[PDB]
Amino acid sequence: HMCDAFVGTWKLVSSENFDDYMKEVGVGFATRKVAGMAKPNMIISVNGDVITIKSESTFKNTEISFILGQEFDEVTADDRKVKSTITLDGGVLVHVQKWDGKSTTIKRKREDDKLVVECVMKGVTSTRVYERA
Ligand SMILES: O=C(O)c1csc(CCc2cccc(Cl)c2)n1
């Protein structure tokens, strides 16, 4: 029952500062523009100890499966090859990505009927709000 409130299909409804976040991560112009235009559906499911997060959009379809606290190698939608660890901290899913001596954290939180995604690198944050599909 660890992630019960996150499970489901969620659709993007708002975004703030995502272009700047992507600039900080190092994403190039054309990818930023097409990725920024995406309106992803995020699909979260749990089977035993294995969590799966899919993100589907006209930009890219991604899928990760993982066990909490257990690192995995990930190819991000922007084509970074990162070492990722996802943990639950106080009811927040905390997704840390390490690559080329850099780090970024993606937090996923349930707030009211929304699923809020907060993306941080260095002092640049982006907040993206999803609603049930
Ligand atoms: O709203 C989302 O699901 C969301 C926000 S950041 C993220 C990781 C994947 C990602 C996609 C495009 C550019 C970069 Cl730099 C990172 N996913």
Short mmCIF file of C-alpha atoms and ligand atoms in Angstrom, two decimals:
data_model
loop_
_atom_site.label_atom_id
_atom_site.label_comp_id
_atom_site.label_asym_id
_atom_site.label_seq_id
_atom_site.Cartn_x
_atom_site.Cartn_y
_atom_site.Cartn_z
CA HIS A 1 0.00 0.00 0.00
CA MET A 2 3.11 2.25 -0.08
CA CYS A 3 2.14 4.47 -3.00
CA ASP A 4 -1.64 3.97 -3.10
CA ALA A 5 -2.49 7.63 -3.48
CA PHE A 6 -0.07 8.05 -6.46
CA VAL A 7 -1.36 5.15 -8.52
CA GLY A 8 -3.42 6.10 -11.55
CA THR A 9 -3.37 8.07 -14.79
CA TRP A 10 -2.63 11.73 -14.52
CA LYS A 11 -2.59 14.52 -17.16
CA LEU A 12 -0.59 17.77 -17.14
CA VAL A 13 -2.66 20.85 -16.40
CA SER A 14 -0.13 23.59 -15.67
CA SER A 15 3.60 24.28 -15.76
CA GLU A 16 5.80 27.08 -14.45
CA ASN A 17 9.49 27.72 -15.13
CA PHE A 18 10.05 24.42 -17.02
CA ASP A 19 11.99 26.05 -19.89
CA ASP A 20 14.42 27.55 -17.34
CA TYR A 21 14.71 24.22 -15.54
CA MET A 22 15.57 22.52 -18.78
CA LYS A 23 18.17 25.25 -19.57
CA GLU A 24 19.80 24.59 -16.20
CA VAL A 25 19.90 20.83 -16.87
CA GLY A 26 21.58 21.57 -20.24
CA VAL A 27 18.80 20.76 -22.73
CA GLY A 28 19.28 22.36 -26.14
CA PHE A 29 16.91 24.75 -27.84
CA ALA A 30 14.90 22.47 -30.14
CA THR A 31 14.40 19.82 -27.50
CA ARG A 32 13.31 22.44 -24.98
CA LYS A 33 10.72 23.85 -27.34
CA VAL A 34 9.18 20.47 -28.27
CA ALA A 35 9.43 19.03 -24.74
CA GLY A 36 8.03 22.16 -23.26
CA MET A 37 5.02 21.94 -25.55
CA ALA A 38 4.29 18.36 -24.44
CA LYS A 39 1.19 17.60 -22.42
CA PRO A 40 2.19 14.28 -20.87
CA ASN A 41 0.04 11.62 -19.26
CA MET A 42 1.89 10.16 -16.27
CA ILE A 43 0.78 6.55 -15.43
CA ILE A 44 1.87 5.21 -12.01
CA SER A 45 1.38 1.58 -11.02
CA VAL A 46 2.61 -0.81 -8.34
CA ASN A 47 3.04 -4.58 -8.49
CA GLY A 48 4.50 -5.91 -5.25
CA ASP A 49 7.62 -3.91 -4.47
CA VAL A 50 8.04 -2.73 -8.06
CA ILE A 51 6.82 0.77 -8.98
CA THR A 52 6.36 1.69 -12.66
CA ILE A 53 6.10 5.29 -13.90
CA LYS A 54 5.27 5.89 -17.55
CA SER A 55 5.18 9.34 -19.21
CA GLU A 56 3.44 9.50 -22.58
CA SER A 57 3.32 12.43 -24.91
CA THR A 58 3.83 13.44 -28.53
CA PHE A 59 7.47 14.37 -27.54
CA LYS A 60 8.51 11.02 -26.01
CA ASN A 61 7.12 7.98 -24.27
CA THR A 62 9.23 6.91 -21.27
CA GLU A 63 8.92 4.07 -18.78
CA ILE A 64 10.85 3.35 -15.58
CA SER A 65 10.42 0.48 -13.11
CA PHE A 66 12.22 0.44 -9.79
CA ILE A 67 12.30 -0.60 -6.16
CA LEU A 68 12.44 2.20 -3.57
CA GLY A 69 15.99 2.96 -2.47
CA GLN A 70 17.57 0.78 -5.15
CA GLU A 71 19.58 2.64 -7.81
CA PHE A 72 19.01 2.10 -11.48
CA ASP A 73 20.41 3.46 -14.76
CA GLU A 74 17.94 5.65 -16.66
CA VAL A 75 17.88 7.29 -20.10
CA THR A 76 15.88 10.47 -19.62
CA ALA A 77 13.49 11.93 -22.16
CA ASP A 78 16.14 14.57 -23.04
CA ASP A 79 18.68 11.75 -23.60
CA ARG A 80 20.83 12.03 -20.50
CA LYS A 81 22.28 8.76 -19.16
CA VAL A 82 21.82 9.07 -15.41
CA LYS A 83 22.05 7.03 -12.22
CA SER A 84 18.68 7.38 -10.44
CA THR A 85 17.40 6.54 -6.96
CA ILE A 86 13.78 6.99 -5.96
CA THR A 87 12.74 7.00 -2.29
CA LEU A 88 9.66 7.84 -0.25
CA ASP A 89 10.39 10.59 2.24
CA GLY A 90 7.52 11.63 4.33
CA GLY A 91 4.99 10.63 1.75
CA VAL A 92 6.85 12.40 -1.12
CA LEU A 93 8.41 10.41 -3.96
CA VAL A 94 11.96 11.81 -4.30
CA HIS A 95 13.75 11.00 -7.59
CA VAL A 96 17.46 11.92 -7.67
CA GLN A 97 19.39 11.78 -10.93
CA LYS A 98 23.22 11.87 -11.00
CA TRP A 99 25.29 12.34 -14.14
CA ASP A 100 28.58 14.02 -15.14
CA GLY A 101 29.11 15.24 -11.55
CA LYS A 102 25.70 17.00 -11.60
CA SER A 103 22.47 16.25 -9.72
CA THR A 104 18.78 17.08 -10.12
CA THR A 105 15.81 16.10 -7.95
CA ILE A 106 12.24 15.52 -9.07
CA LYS A 107 9.66 15.40 -6.23
CA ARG A 108 6.13 14.03 -6.73
CA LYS A 109 3.55 14.99 -4.12
CA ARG A 110 -0.19 14.39 -3.65
CA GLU A 111 -1.86 17.69 -2.78
CA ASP A 112 -5.67 17.82 -2.69
CA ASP A 113 -6.79 16.05 -5.91
CA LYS A 114 -3.56 16.92 -7.73
CA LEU A 115 -0.21 15.30 -8.24
CA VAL A 116 2.41 18.06 -8.08
CA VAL A 117 5.84 17.60 -9.71
CA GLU A 118 8.67 19.85 -8.49
CA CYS A 119 11.90 19.70 -10.54
CA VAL A 120 15.02 21.37 -9.00
CA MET A 121 18.54 21.96 -10.12
CA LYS A 122 20.84 24.35 -8.34
CA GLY A 123 18.44 27.23 -7.56
CA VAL A 124 16.13 26.67 -10.56
CA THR A 125 12.78 25.05 -9.77
CA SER A 126 9.84 24.15 -11.95
CA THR A 127 6.38 23.20 -10.63
CA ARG A 128 4.09 21.10 -12.81
CA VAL A 129 0.55 20.19 -11.79
CA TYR A 130 -1.24 17.02 -12.91
CA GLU A 131 -4.91 16.06 -12.49
CA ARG A 132 -6.56 12.68 -12.74
CA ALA A 133 -7.22 11.71 -16.41
O1 LIG B 1 6.42 16.75 -15.66
C1 LIG B 1 7.17 15.78 -15.73
O2 LIG B 1 6.75 14.59 -15.70
C2 LIG B 1 8.61 16.03 -15.69
C3 LIG B 1 9.36 17.16 -15.35
S1 LIG B 1 10.98 16.90 -15.40
C4 LIG B 1 10.81 15.37 -15.84
C5 LIG B 1 11.94 14.44 -16.16
C6 LIG B 1 12.07 14.16 -17.64
C7 LIG B 1 12.50 15.36 -18.46
C8 LIG B 1 11.80 15.69 -19.61
C9 LIG B 1 12.22 16.74 -20.44
C10 LIG B 1 13.33 17.50 -20.04
C11 LIG B 1 14.00 17.20 -18.89
CL1 LIG B 1 15.27 18.18 -18.43
C12 LIG B 1 13.57 16.15 -18.09
N1 LIG B 1 9.53 14.92 -15.98
#
